[PDB]
Amino acid sequence: MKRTFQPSTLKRARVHGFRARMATKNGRQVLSRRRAKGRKRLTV
Amino acid sequence: MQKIRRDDEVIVIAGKDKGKRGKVLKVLADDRLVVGGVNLIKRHTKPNPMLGQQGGIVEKEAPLHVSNVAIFNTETSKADRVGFKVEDGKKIRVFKSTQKPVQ
RNA sequence: GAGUCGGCAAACAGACUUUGAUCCGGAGAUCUCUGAAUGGGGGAACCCACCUAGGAUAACCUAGGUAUCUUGUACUGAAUCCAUAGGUGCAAGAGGCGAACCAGGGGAACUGAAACAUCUAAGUACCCUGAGGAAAAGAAAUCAACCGAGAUUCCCUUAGUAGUGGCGAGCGAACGGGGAUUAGCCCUUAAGCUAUUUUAGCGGAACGCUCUGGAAAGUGCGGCCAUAGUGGGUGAUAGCCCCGUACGCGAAAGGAUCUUUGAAGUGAAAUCAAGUAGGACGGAGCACGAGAAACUUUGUCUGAACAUGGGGGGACCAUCCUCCAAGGCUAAAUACUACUGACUGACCGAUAGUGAACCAGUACCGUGAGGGAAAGGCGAAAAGAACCCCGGAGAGGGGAGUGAAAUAGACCUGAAACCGUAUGCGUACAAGCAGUGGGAGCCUACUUGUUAGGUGACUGCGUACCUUUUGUAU
RNA sequence: AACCCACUCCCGUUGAAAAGGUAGGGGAUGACUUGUGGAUCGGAGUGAAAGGCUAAUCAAGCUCGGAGAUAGCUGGUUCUC
């Protein structure tokens, strides 16, 4: 039956994208923390 | 600058073939020297592809370390350390036993 | 200064020799799109543009400009007569990121108290805002007792002492001594001033025969160096084979640090103090939980004397002592390490040491924040197996060759559990923690039988180990 | 009848499936079903109300810090005489 994940690219970018994280103040701290660990991606 | 150049004539100390008078062909960058005539190796190689041949066993020289050969003197006819004690326009390679410049 | 075209790794094509080719250091030029991202927008690495001066053919290209806020500065001018708001044009600055350090704003709970409300934990964790290479603090309305000491900051004692505390758990000073460091000055505002090292390099001393070995640095036998003899690495153990190790020279050019020096700030450099001191309720900070509670603070409400005054000396009062509050400025001793460089280890040696010696914050697991592994070693050197035979024209083997050695063959050593193949002896009428005491026979060796080893028919006694418990074969 | 839902029996339970299947059932022009896009969040939302749902987790999620929380309670504690 209906599993709990139905994919879409327009909903993914507006919630978890870069311009969404960079807009707020918590999200810019999510960027610096995830960058300074050294991850390859930063924008899932 | 380096004791041993391409165009020399040396002798081999402390190897398979010690005392063999030789002459340097190729100097590698990991202090290993291909001396012309000594340290012979034989390579089982397949006959070459794409319109080539090799057949079988073909000799060549395997390099040896730079701390094994030395510059040969031809005035005592034995191995001699070299040096750069003459520098007036250029560092001249000079034997330390006789203070005479190499050629 | 003679080889070179980065690393994981072959065959092509070529550049310069004796110097500027690789290669190392200084300075410049280019520097696509994203990102504070800043011409307007966006789903980060995309779309649509204007303006100006030039060039270009019904289709464009160069070159700059074009964000908001602060300050200033022009021009401009609403209701409104004046003239402020407001609007444009220009100049200068800021914005973002970074491990810890410092000062402020806000500030928990678990837990202790063998429960728990005061109290502890604790003004600690965390969250914001500033600034600096340090910050803050500092030049007496301070402490001492009738003796005196003269800024602050930091370490050692006074002392776990006086105090404080459901007088419980606990929290805890100062005075005085010893040290480190050794300056004081005054108006942002009456009337202000606020010469050496460093990034590149270069020279750098002293050994010969003889054995064994695949290979000598080792066995022998002698000599030499020394301001450099416990380094690295070379076919095995090297002061004298190779790179290095003690001193000097520096350096076109930059950098920094002390100087002269330039401006300006670094700033040497004048007074002083009104809604101020005090007061009354309400809170904080003082070691100090309304306590006889001094003192500093400020949210509400009030309010002085003019340095003939003032305020301090732990309720309070008289006498003595000691300092000038309501304006400012300051080096040094001090705290810290994301980043370097040397060095050092009674530190680790691939289940240790970083999560990470290996292409690791990767693979993978998550819608996300986030979590997060496993993975080293052939040889001195690829000399990495030409050639033959079986096989699917393969996989895998059997030779042959290299090598000191292939049971070092794509890999040092190579154990245990687990699985096999040979050889010996015992087991198809015999009941159980599978062993122990006696013991026939057979086997293989040695003098040949106690010289020893391996099996064990038969037979007597025999209900594993740990933990909990008054006791467990249980 | 499509379509949405889940009343009964049997099979399945190491399932084909971390909730299905084959037979039968109820609504089926509306207090309907549904596609795309948005809004509401942790002592806080939503709820024709069952303490139900909020990413297979819910009498108060998930993750990182305080934090090696506290345990008069269980389990274990290694060579000889």
Place this chain on the structure above:
RNA sequence: AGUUGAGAAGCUUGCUGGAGGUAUCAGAAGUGCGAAUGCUGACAUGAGUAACGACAAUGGGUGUGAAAAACACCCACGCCGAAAGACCAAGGGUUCCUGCGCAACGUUAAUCGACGCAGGGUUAGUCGGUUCCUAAGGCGAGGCUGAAAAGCGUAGUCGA
């Protein structure tokens, strides 16, 4: 394997191994495992046992090949046909097509493949996007409000 001590343990040798080892006596300890439903790799018993994923059926021939129940072609049977057929939207990301292969994968074998290596292959004034305009909703110069972060919102400019 032998041998020596009350014991922890010591000592001498046969083979493998191929470069390091430590009398003696003192120090410094990450100093000795069978057990924690201990932790991480290896290997067992169950056991060559259950299963091999819908009860829409396949049977011959010819071919290739080292080898055909499953591959290709042929002939004949079956099954869906308001889907087991065609096509747009999401989503995926080269799975499409052709040479070469078959160790691994595919619940068996494979000469076959959505599997390996090497090439190839998507053509727009009109079809969908972008460009123009807006709904819910978002952000929001100036502006009010707030310890700080920030909250709300006018002009405006994004959002099918």
